[PDB]
Amino acid sequence: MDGSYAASYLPWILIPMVGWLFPAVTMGLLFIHIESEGEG
Amino acid sequence: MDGSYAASYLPWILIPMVGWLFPAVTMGLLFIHIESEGEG
Amino acid sequence: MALSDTQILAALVVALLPAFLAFRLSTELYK
Amino acid sequence: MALSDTQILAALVVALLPAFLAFRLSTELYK
Amino acid sequence: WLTFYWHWKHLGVWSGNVAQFNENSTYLMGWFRDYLWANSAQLINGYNPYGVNNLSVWAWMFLFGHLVWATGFMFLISWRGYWQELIETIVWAHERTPLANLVRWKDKPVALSIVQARLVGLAHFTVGYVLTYAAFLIASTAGKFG
Amino acid sequence: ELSGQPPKFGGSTGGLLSKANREEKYAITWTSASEQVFEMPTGGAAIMNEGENLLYLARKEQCLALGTQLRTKFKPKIQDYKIYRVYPSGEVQYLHPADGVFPEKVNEGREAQGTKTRRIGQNPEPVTIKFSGKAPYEV
Amino acid sequence: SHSVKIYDTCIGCTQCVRACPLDVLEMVPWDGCKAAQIASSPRTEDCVGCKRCETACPTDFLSIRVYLGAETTRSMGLAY
Amino acid sequence: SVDNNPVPTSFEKWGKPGHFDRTLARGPKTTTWIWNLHANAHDFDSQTSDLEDVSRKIFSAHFGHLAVVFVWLSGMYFHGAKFSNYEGWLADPTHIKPSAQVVWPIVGQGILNGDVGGGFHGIQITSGLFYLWRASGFTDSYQLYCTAIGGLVMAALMLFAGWFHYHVKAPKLEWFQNVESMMNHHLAGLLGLGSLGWAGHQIHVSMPINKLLDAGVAPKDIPLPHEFILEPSKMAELYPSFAQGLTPFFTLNWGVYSDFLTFKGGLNPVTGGLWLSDTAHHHLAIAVLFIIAGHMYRTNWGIGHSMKEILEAHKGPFTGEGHKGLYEILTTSWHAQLAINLALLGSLTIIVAQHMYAMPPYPYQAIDYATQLSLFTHHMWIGGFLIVGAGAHGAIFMVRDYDPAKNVNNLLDRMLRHRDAIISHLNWVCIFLGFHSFGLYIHNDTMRALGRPQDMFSDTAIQLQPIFAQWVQHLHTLAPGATAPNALATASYAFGGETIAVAGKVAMMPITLGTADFMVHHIHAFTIHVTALILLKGVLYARSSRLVPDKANLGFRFPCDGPGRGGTCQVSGWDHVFLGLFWMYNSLSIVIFHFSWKMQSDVWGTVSPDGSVTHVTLGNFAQSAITINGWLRDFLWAQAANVINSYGSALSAYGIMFLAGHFVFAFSLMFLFSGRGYWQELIESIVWAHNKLNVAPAIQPRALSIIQGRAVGVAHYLLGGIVTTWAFFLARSLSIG
Amino acid sequence: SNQVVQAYNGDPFVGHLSTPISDSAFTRTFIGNLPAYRKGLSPILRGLEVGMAHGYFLIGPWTLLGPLRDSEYQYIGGLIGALALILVATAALSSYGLVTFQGEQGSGDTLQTADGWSQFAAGFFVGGMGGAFVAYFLLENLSVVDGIFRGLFN
Ligand code: CLA
Ligand code: CLA
Ligand code: CLA
Ligand code: CLA
Ligand code: CLA
Ligand code: CLA
Ligand SMILES: CCCCCCCCCCCCCCCC(=O)OC[C@H](COP(=O)(O)OC[C@@H](O)CO)OC(=O)CCCCCCCCCCCCCCC
Ligand SMILES: CCCCCCCCCCCCCCCC(=O)OC[C@H](COP(=O)(O)OC[C@@H](O)CO)OC(=O)CCCCCCCCCCCCCCC
Ligand code: SF4
Ligand code: SF4
Ligand SMILES: [Ca+2]
Ligand SMILES: [Cl-]
């Protein structure tokens, strides 16, 4: 994969960030939140 | 070392298994057993 | 003509502002 | 002629059976 | 029905062969053959053993929509209590398996509710319906004309 | 404490899970004139002893299905079973029959709960009780 | 827990109490019917929501009504 | 012990429907009554509580069913003799296709009377009746007419026997419970003596006209089947072993008969059928083994076995009290016997389907690809339906006839005690199999769509070679001469050998097994395991579960125990049958699709005179059947062109049913996706409209019951899908050529 | 008697069976001496041993079947896949431990506390990436391991 557009390193870094880092972080935070036995 | 016989990778894996893995595992299990202060 | 690298990075720096504002609005809507 | 690789592996798969049976006999003789 | 009619009329109009619609839409075998079967040929050859073309994504999405529609058929046809009993056996299996008994669920696994079953099956049915027809529409029109 | 001999059983996979030692279990005690075979509500057959029998089950419904079997599937009808709820702290709460009389027969001292002095069709409209947190049947 | 309500068309046939598999209902003395008994639901925390009592009720537009509400371990019938 | 005139014969109770059910006999109040009536007709255990009268009803119903089957067979022989071209096909097999149905010219339907050969206009029959009739030695229309008349007479005899054994002279219960004699009478009787008589028929009648028709004799020049038995000189003219008579049979010298009783194997290379000498020797060996088997059990002379004692002796350290009690179950419960018989008969029909294609036993059946495909698919579907019925009647026995006091620590009680372990491990196996077969297909579709064919699962990529099946095929190929020394050829050429090339067409070749075969066989394993999981969970949890502990009190056939406990709809054994029906349907659709594609791709086709074979779909199965898209495009889309371009021709009826099944399946979804509360409220609105014009019926209309809605849905689903696949398969295989 | 199938821990009403798979002497002495159950172990040692075994075997599937298997960086791709999977597994383990042991801490197993499960997750991380790198270092210099096992250098 490559790109002739400006800042072609940005899909290179952001496709794993939006595909792996963002959903793993979001589901981890949501899993910790929806099982929180804090008050109710 | 090599072999013209069938499955010549088997001495390659089994000489360290019978020389190292089997006696170390056997003496470890036997050392744990003969020092067991369980009942008598 | 095509855009520049600095244009794209400046747009992402700009997009940091509605990200923070959406965080604030979702936090305020949560309570 | 010489034996095959599959012959040797089948013999080892067969030898798994007296291994289990010797484990059973030694365990039963221990008690 | 309306999108099938609109697309078959526009395929007849755009290609100039309106006679296919004018002599074959009056019976349903014409709809089956001259619209559904004929216009899938470029779509399902988006990928084949000989290679791919630009319609590969539409063939994959066509199959994906078929799969999601049929997955909705599960929740639509089979109902809750069978699944609740099956999940009870799976719960038993987890509670008796060593090195996995160290792991416990925080919420008790149950089957989906009856309304949830209907909603989930309908959602899959609708997603599959939409994706299947969108893949067929885009691939047939972009292969014949685009 | 709860007394009775456990019915002789080979064991089954349908019995108590970790909920029994974690949240609650249930117990059913009954006196038997003879030694005969009953059906476990968790699948299979067990043999109940002569005299007192104490059985531990996962749900109240399993104990009550066993009690229905005891009242209906034996020629001398076992009509004296007691069903209890057992907590992991050790406290045993008596459940059934609560007043000593089976609930299909009336008894004095039973208070009417869940009884409505209006008919089914004279429940008020939901629009009259909006933003109150209570249903038409709760008012 | 689910809510079990008994309305004043009850004629004290005790069929809802006999049909209930979880001992939710009793029959208490009453005066509104010739049988002089009305069904009651003191043990709705054990109710699972099976509506067998509704099926057993012979009055047209049943005098017993089960409303599924808050779901518990007892109400979902969980042995685990 | 036979009763004398138990039930009188009167015409009065025919006119009052619902006599058999006590609730039905009050009269109709709702329409459900009518729907209850047909639903309650054959449930004999529910109408009467005594086992004796239930057995009487079953015996008379069995005679009625045999009468129905005889009427069907008589109609088949009548349609093969008057309205057929068996004359004309028999002199010229490979120019004329079989056709045994003639359709009147009305409303334009005479187009279906297609040109099949020899100036005939009729529907090309694909059941294979002509090939079996040739294999039996039939040569004239008058003998087929005689067989039809004899079938009508036997149907009348079956009807009279049913009337006699229900109304006049009817047996007692211990006649039925004497199963020790019944098994001897069925093994040494029905099967053994029937196969001995058919071996005698083979050797005397079916072999001569078959071998003369294979030699080249015209069918009119073969005189008639009886004149062989009139003069034994014709056998010694043709099979020269018929010179010593019956002397080598009784004097341990059976090698004299090694001229009409052989061990060749393979196929006859004039017809493509099995060798008739091989089948006669097989039938004789089967007869002798079955006579030997039918002297196992004690009947009336104190010699034999007790099945109870054999069962009670089988117990081990793992299984407690073992097989204690199973004799009492299988002698008191009709449903338990029906379950195990349906399982074994469905497995047998599937075994018949799998054995018949690879060893074609009828002349010119193998080169008729339509007949081969039709017979395989029909017998597959029959077997799958019977296995579902087996699961059904196992659950019915569990609800009705099971007794826990009389099964303590035997096998069945221990099944019920570890059903959680059984079902959970079967669940894990089903998930594992679904992943590691269908996800392999999904992987392949994705890697082909992404332009990565070197990453697929295929023979030209990551290989999944079925090496055990290949090794067994190799062992079958080296069987005849090393491990089967007296066998001349292999058992079937599908295992390995050479291609039989009867006429210009193929009959059998080595069916090679590669990655696609591995994938589709594990798909079969997966789907069979899921159908088994559904039916076995329905059997093992028919009485109770952790969800509903009193399920046996609710019965076998009930919709639910209410919306509570989260929701308990489809907990009954009947609903497990309902779900297993769809899963068996899915399993068998994939099995017959695998069969059709592999036979058209790697077996069937046209043989060149040089020895090369051009296949029907040119070997595309190795590269296209590894993806779902390949199954969609190269199998479904490509081969449906025959069924959709059939309009205006004789195959157009196959077009119409191709539409028609598509209707019924979709119609089924109305019943499958909806619930009866909506339909009842809609019916209330239509009754109000009928109240306005005073057309309200006295029998009040209701919506269908929940169980009946599910039953209508599954029936219409299976009917529409099976009719669609039937139309597609037949219009493809009547156009393969 | 001779019956090898008994009630689980002598209670026939607990939903389990004493089987030669579930409750044989070999089963108890093997499972109870696995690191997750071995008596006296600190939870970091349990996690360390579990991680070493798991990270060592997780090298293999992407090494032999992954998309880099036909390139010159086959062992590299196997290692990166194993490291990323061990990272996801460690995140899942630590999130499970944070969720499960929110409230009171038991006085029984040290493993089944928030402190012990965090120690176990730390050990699992260290062992997983250690086992993955030691299996990669064996596979990348597999020629040297082969020459060592055949005495080619000596
Ligand atoms: C909502 C509109 C929208 C959509 C559908 C997409 C879609 C996409 N973007 Mg994109 N983008 C957007 C807005 C959007 N963008 C905006 C406003 C900017 C800033 C000017 C960017 C800057 C951007 C860059 C720099 C890159 C992409 C890329 C991509 C592709 C991969 C995803 C990714 O890495 O995102 C990364 C996106 C960002 C880092 C910017 C955040 C995007 C906006 C500001 C957030 C919107 C949130 C949304 C509206 C909230 C509701 C969501 C809903 C689920 C509830 C994908 C086609 C990649 C690409 O080209 O692949 C080929 C890539 O490198 N985008
Ligand atoms: C007791 C007889 C016996 C003896 C003395 C040996 C000796 C040897 N074998 Mg051997 N082997 C045997 C039986 C035996 N084998 C059998 C029956 C098989 C299966 C068909 C094999 C299969 C086998 C393979 C595949 C290989 C060897 C190899 C070797 C050599 C190295 C040791 C090793 O790696 O073992 C490995 C052995 C096994 C994995 C198989 C287990 C051996 C048997 C079944 C166990 C016998 C246990 C014993 C009788 C118990 C009493 C022992 C006593 C101390 C109390 C060594 C010369 C290696 C070699 O060729 O090196 C050049 C090698 O690669 N063997
Ligand atoms: C009968 C069995 C046996 C075998 C097969 C060997 C084999 C070997 N010995 Mg040896 N030795 C033995 C008995 C044996 N010895 C005995 C009984 C004695 C004396 C009492 C000696 C004394 C001896 C000396 C004094 C020396 C050797 C050395 C060596 C090695 C020379 C090559 C080298 O550098 O290895 C390098 C490889 C290793 C040391 C082991 C490699 C094992 C793997 C690759 C590493 C671990 C992998 C992983 C983390 C664990 C896997 C987990 C799971 C899959 C099992 C060679 C492998 C020399 C040596 O060790 O050199 C370093 C050396 O100096 N030997
Ligand atoms: C040896 C075979 C055999 C036998 C003896 C029985 C016997 C019995 N079964 Mg059974 N069953 C069988 C095979 C068999 N079945 C198979 C193969 C299946 C799987 C599909 C089932 C599934 C099954 C269920 C699910 C149930 C039974 C029930 C019953 C009992 C009453 C039957 C009844 O209601 O009749 C009346 C039958 C009907 C009203 C059905 C007629 C409608 C069918 C579906 C039409 C089929 C379409 C037709 C082929 C083509 C339509 C043409 C049209 C377009 C013109 C009785 C004990 C029932 C019972 O009460 O259990 C005790 C019950 O609930 N069975
Ligand atoms: C095509 C539609 C479809 C599909 C996919 C399924 C799938 C399944 N059914 Mg099913 N079912 C269907 C239609 C379908 N059904 C219909 C119409 C009915 C009505 C009669 C039923 C009735 C039914 C019953 C009654 C039973 C099942 C069972 C099963 C399971 C079998 C075990 C298995 O294969 O696990 C493996 C799972 C699959 C093969 C599904 C596909 C997985 C894909 C290939 C992998 C996806 C990768 C990844 C996860 C994607 C994530 C994306 C990311 C962004 C998150 C499985 C979940 C049985 C069961 O639970 O047994 C264990 C069972 O008892 N079903
Ligand atoms: C800016 C703050 C920050 C940073 C740099 C890190 C960095 C790290 N965390 Mg972490 N974490 C954070 C905040 C942070 N965390 C918070 C606030 C929580 C509480 C929810 C966690 C909970 C958490 C767990 C439960 C685990 C880690 C782990 C890790 C390491 C693995 C790499 C990783 O997660 O992706 C790099 C991360 C970032 C670029 C940003 C992370 C910031 C968000 C808030 C983390 C969300 C939590 C999520 C469940 C963990 C991510 C998993 C990963 C697969 C994406 C890494 C050193 C794992 C490990 O190995 O620890 C020993 C592990 O098991 N973290
Ligand atoms: C495809 C072929 C190549 C792969 C074969 C793989 C075999 C799979 C593993 C072996 C299964 C062993 C069961 C027999 C061994 C067996 O019969 O043991 C014998 C034992 C009965 O012992 P007793 O001495 O008590 O028996 C006396 C008997 O007469 C009954 O009273 O049965 C049990 O313990 C039941 C538990 C079976 C638990 C295993 C469940 C089987 C699930 C797997 C089924 C897979 C079949 C796969 C092949 C079709
Ligand atoms: C491939 C072709 C299609 C085959 C698909 C079939 C799937 C198998 C479905 C079997 C379930 C039924 C077994 C009884 C289970 C059961 O009873 O069914 C369910 C339903 C009634 O069940 P309920 O639970 O409502 O019954 C309550 C009663 O139990 C108490 O009164 O019965 C019917 O649907 C009656 C309607 C029959 C319609 C009568 C129409 C006349 C058709 C007769 C012609 C038949 C073919 C004759 C030969 C040509
Ligand atoms: S819904 Fe079921 S459990 Fe609840 S009161 Fe009615 S019968 Fe009893
Ligand atoms: S949806 Fe229908 S089948 Fe399911 S619980 Fe409710 S009434 Fe019963
Ligand atoms: Ca690659
Ligand atoms: Cl493809």
Swiss-Prot record, chains C, D:
Pfam families for this protein: PsaM
Alphabetically ordered keywords of this record: Membrane, Photosynthesis, Photosystem I, Thylakoid, Transmembrane, Transmembrane helix
Keyword Thylakoid: yes
TM regions (residue ranges): 6-25
Range of residues in the leader sequence: none
One record GO biological process: photosynthesis
One GO location term (cellular component): plasma membrane-derived thylakoid membrane
Principal localisation: membrane
Classification via InterPro entries: PSI_PsaM, PSI_PsaM_sf
UniProt similarity note: Belongs to the PsaM family.
Protein name (record): Photosystem I reaction center subunit XII
Organism this protein belongs to: Synechocystis sp. (strain ATCC 27184 / PCC 6803 / Kazusa)
From Swiss-Prot, chain G:
Binding site for [4Fe-4S] cluster 1: 10, 13, 16, 57
Residue stretches making up the 4Fe-4S ferredoxin-type domain: 1-30, 38-67
Named cofactor requirement(s): [4Fe-4S] cluster
Membrane-topology annotation of the record: Peripheral membrane protein
Keywords: 4Fe-4S, Electron transport, Iron, Iron-sulfur, Membrane, Metal-binding, Oxidoreductase, Photosynthesis, Photosystem I, Repeat, Thylakoid, Transport
Pfam family, any one: Fer4_7
UniProt EC number: 1.97.1.12
Example of a GO cellular component annotation carried by this entry: photosystem I
Major place of residence: membrane
GO molecular function: 4 iron, 4 sulfur cluster binding; electron transfer activity; metal ion binding; oxidoreductase activity
UniProt-listed PANTHER family: PHOTOSYSTEM I IRON-SULFUR CENTER, PHOTOSYSTEM I IRON-SULFUR CENTER-RELATED
Protein name (database record): Photosystem I iron-sulfur center
UniProtKB/Swiss-Prot annotation, chain H:
Membrane topology field: Multi-pass membrane protein
A GO molecular-function descriptor: 4 iron, 4 sulfur cluster binding
Positions bound to chlorophyll a': 662
Keyword Oxidoreductase set for record: yes
InterPro entries assigned: PSI_PsaA (IPR006243), PSI_PsaA/B (IPR001280), PSI_PsaA/B_CS (IPR020586), PSI_PsaA/B_sf (IPR036408)
EC code(s) of this entry: 1.97.1.12
Keywords of this entry: 4Fe-4S, Chlorophyll, Chromophore, Electron transport, Iron, Iron-sulfur, Magnesium, Membrane, Metal-binding, Oxidoreductase, Photosynthesis, Photosystem I, Thylakoid, Transmembrane, Transmembrane helix, Transport
GO biological process: photosynthesis
PROSITE patterns listed in its UniProt record: PHOTOSYSTEM_I_PSAAB (PS00419)
TM helices/strands, residue ranges: 58-81, 144-167, 183-207, 279-297, 334-357, 373-399, 421-443, 518-536, 576-597, 651-673, 711-731
Binding site residues for phylloquinone: 679
Domain of life of the organism encoding this protein: Bacteria
Entry keyword annotation includes Nucleotide-binding: no
GO terms under cellular component: photosystem I; plasma membrane; plasma membrane-derived thylakoid membrane
Pfam families: PsaA_PsaB (PF00223)
Binding site residues for chlorophyll a: 670, 678
Binding locations of [4Fe-4S] cluster: 560, 569
Family: Belongs to the PsaA/PsaB family.
Function: PsaA and PsaB bind P700, the primary electron donor of photosystem I (PSI), as well as the electron acceptors A0, A1 and FX. PSI is a plastocyanin/cytochrome c6-ferredoxin oxidoreductase, converting photonic excitation into a charge separation, which transfers an electron from the donor P700 chlorophyll pair to the spectroscopically characterized acceptors A0, A1, FX, FA and FB in turn. Oxidized P700 is reduced on the lumenal side of the thylakoid membrane by plastocyanin or cytochrome c6.
NCBIfam families: psaA
The name this protein goes by in its record: Photosystem I P700 chlorophyll a apoprotein A1
UniProtKB/Swiss-Prot annotation, chain I:
Membrane-spanning parts: 79-99, 124-144
One GO BP annotation of this record: photosynthesis
Entry keyword Kinase: no
Source domain of life: Bacteria
Gene3D superfamilies linked to this entry: Photosystem I PsaL, reaction centre subunit XI (1.20.1240.10)
Cellular component aspect of the GO annotation: photosystem I; photosystem I reaction center; plasma membrane; plasma membrane-derived thylakoid membrane
Sequence similarity: Belongs to the PsaL family.
Name of the featured protein: Photosystem I reaction center subunit XI
Organism: Synechocystis sp. (strain ATCC 27184 / PCC 6803 / Kazusa)
UniProt lineage: Bacteria, Bacillati, Cyanobacteriota, Cyanophyceae, Synechococcales
